Amino acid sequence: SVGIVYGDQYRQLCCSSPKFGDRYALVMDLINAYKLIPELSRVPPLQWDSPSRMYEAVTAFHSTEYVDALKKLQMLHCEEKELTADDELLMDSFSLNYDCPGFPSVFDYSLAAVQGSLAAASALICRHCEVVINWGGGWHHAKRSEASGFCYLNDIVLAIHRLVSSTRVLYVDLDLHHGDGVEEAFWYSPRVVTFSVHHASPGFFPGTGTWNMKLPIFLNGAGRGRFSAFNLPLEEGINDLDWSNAIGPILDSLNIVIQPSYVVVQCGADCLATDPHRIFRLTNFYPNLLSGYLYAIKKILSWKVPTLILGGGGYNFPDTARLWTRVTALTIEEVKGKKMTISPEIPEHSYFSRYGPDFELDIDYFPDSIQKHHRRILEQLRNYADLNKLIYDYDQVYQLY
Ligand SMILES: O=C(NO)c1cn(-c2cc(Cl)ccc2Oc2ccc(F)cc2)nn1
Ligand SMILES: [K+]
Ligand SMILES: [K+]
Ligand SMILES: [Zn+2]
Numbered sequence: 001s002v003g004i005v006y007g008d009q010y011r012q013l014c015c016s017s018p019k020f021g022d023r024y025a026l027v028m029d030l031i032n033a034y035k036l037i038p039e040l041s042r043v044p045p046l047q048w049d050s051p052s053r054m055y056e057a058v059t060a061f062h063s064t065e066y067v068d069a070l071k072k073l074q075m076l077h078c079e080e081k082e083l084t085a086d087d088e089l090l091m092d093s094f095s096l097n098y099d100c101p102g103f104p105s106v107f108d109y110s111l112a113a114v115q116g117s118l119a120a121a122s123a124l125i126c127r128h129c130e131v132v133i134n135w136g137g138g139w140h141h142a143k144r145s146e147a148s149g150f151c152y153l154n155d156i157v158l159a160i161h162r163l164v165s166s167t168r169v170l171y172v173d174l175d176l177h178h179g180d181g182v183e184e185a186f187w188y189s190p191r192v193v194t195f196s197v198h199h200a201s202p203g204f205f206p207g208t209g210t211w212n213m214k215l216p217i218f219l220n221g222a223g224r225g226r227f228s229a230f231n232l233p234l235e236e237g238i239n240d241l242d243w244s245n246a247i248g249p250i251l252d253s254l255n256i257v258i259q260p261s262y263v264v265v266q267c268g269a270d271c272l273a274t275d276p277h278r279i280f281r282l283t284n285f286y287p288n289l290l291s292g293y294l295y296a297i298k299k300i301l302s303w304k305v306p307t308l309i310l311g312g313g314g315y316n317f318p319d320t321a322r323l324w325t326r327v328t329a330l331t332i333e334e335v336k337g338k339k340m341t342i343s344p345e346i347p348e349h350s351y352f353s354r355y356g357p358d359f360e361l362d363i364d365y366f367p368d369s370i371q372k373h374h375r376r377i378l379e380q381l382r383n384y385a386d387l388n389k390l391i392y393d394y395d396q397v398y399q400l401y
Contacts (some may be wrong), residue, residue: 002044002128002335003043004031005136010045010297013112014136016105017149021318025366025384027135030321033115033349034342038147041334043123043132045115056227058114061185066145069094074107075107077150087358100147108154111395113137115187117155117310121162124262124306131307132333138266138312139364140179141206150207154267157185158174159308163262168307170260172251173311174280174296178209178231181400188225190388193248193258197247199279200233220380227384230254232373239367243271243292245382248299248361249400250377256305256400257385257392267293267327268312269320273365276315284323284363286330293323294330301334319363374401 014024020282031037048054058067060343070242073096076083083091091097103109110279113136120132141149156171160182163169171186173196186192200210210233211218221228232246254260271280271292280291300307313319329340344362346355358364378401385392 001032001129002040002331003120003123003132005040005043005045005120005132005134006038007045007332010129010136011106013108014102017109017150018101021317023314023320025134025352026317027311027324029349029351030230030346034325034329036325036328036332036340038335039338040133040328041120041338043129043134045112046110046119046122047099047115051397054111057158058111058153058377060161061144062142063153066094067080069096070110070147071107073102074105077104077106078101095148096152098180099150100130100152106152110139112251113155114137114158116155117308118162121159124164124322125163127306131301131309131335133309133328133331135311138175139175139309140175140266140268140270140312141181142171142182143210144186147178151181154181154185154312156182156264160186160260160264162194163264163308164189166256167191167261168193169262169264170254170258171264171266172296172300173266173294174271175195176275176277177232177313178206178270179266180206180208183209183229183231185230186225187221188223190224190228190384193228193230193254193260193384194252194340195230195232195254197234197243199236200235206353211364218376227264227380227387230377230380232377234273234280234389235369237281240283240290240292240295242370243280243282244295245289246373247292247296249398251299253378253381253397253400255305255388256397257381260305263300263303263307264362265297265300265307266310266312267324269293269316269323270312272314272316272319272323272363273367274363275315281365281367282362283365283367284319284326286326291323291326296325297327297330298334301331318351320342322355322361322363
């Protein structure tokens with residue numbers, strides 16, 4: 001069974017931010033327009049019975065002072081007065097500025113994603129669902145005491161913490177950007193293995209997930225977490241097939257060696273060829289019998305491990321809905337076995353006009369370094385397995401590449 005996080009108030013809050021606008025409404029309404037909702041179990045966002053319980057949940061990762069400042073930022077933006085000099089300094093000390101500004105619902109908006117992803121983790125733990133989707137979540141850049149990349153609270157870190165505290169988790173980050181906040185949270189933890197594939201290049205946000213400065217080294221975790229943070233930075237312009245071939249054997253080898261209890265996938269849509277970043281050239285194409293995204297999700301779901309699928313980046317809202325609608329239909333198909341039939345034409349619904357001018361489900365796109373990374377990653381995986389007394393066929397894994 002496949003769950004999906006939704007609710008009336010949740011939708012309103014997920015649509016209340018200045019950067020992401022009504023994206024979540026387009027996503028859920030396109031899923032609904034394609035008649036997928038009856039196949040999915042609604043997972044209600046988590047609520048608490050007191051402010052103390054909410055604070056206890058969020059400060060399992062974030063500092064109390066950061067959570068206080070974020071709540072104060074919302075309060076200050078609900079009045080018409082400007083911030084005092086001292087309040088500006090306070091907000092700047094948590095990077096609550098620039099690309100992470102305040103707005104009247106900023107705390108409720110950020111908290112909603114946490115509520116959604118925590119409920120999704122719980123649904124997996126109690127075996128209510130085999131997969132849960134949360135397209136309102138996936139905010140991988142937020143740090144313990146710092147907003148980053150329009151991520152204010154790290155719903156992913158909190159969801160993973162709930163999963164491990166119930167056990168190994170494999171986290172897979174498909175966003176265009178490095179999953180730095182999740183990687184940092186579990187830097188010292190061998191039980192949460194993180195793997196991000198992303199673009200990296202000089203000056204490109206957030207800057208990590210690649211060689212860093214003698215001669216540059218690839219960091220991969222620390223303490224008992226040594227070798228437990230994996231990264232695959234890729235040059236711009238990569239297409240569906242090359243991205244699939246780059247990530248495929250890594251994913252299979254991580255699953256073989258780690259044998260995760262849970263998989264958490266961040267599925268940010270900014271690798272699409274039609275994202276305004278214009279960096280990678282992935283699609284949402286799906287042969288009627290191939291999108292890098294759909295390739296990766298189908299492979300992960302074939303492992304039959306309880307899986308959380310989250311959203312993330314994606315600044316072309318209709319094309320993000322086009323992709324996540326196909327991910328949703330694929331999840332139903334792989335988990336249930338029930339074939340899912342999706343018309344090539346966008347169905348009439350509230351946001352139909354946003355899919356002009358051609359109103360198709362396919363996005364409007366005409367389609368050695370990696371060998372070195374594979375050897376480095378395969379070596380790190382062996383080192384990880386040696387440090388953690390795990391054993392595996394050091395030949396069947398090698399064969400995968
Ligand atoms: O999605 C993200 N990470 O997961 C993410 C993306 N940025 C980001 C960083 C810089 Cl310096 C500039 C624009 C950024 O976003 C965009 C890019 C294009 C756009 F049309 C709308 C938003 N920051 N975080
Ligand atoms: K990524
Ligand atoms: K780790
Ligand atoms: Zn991104």
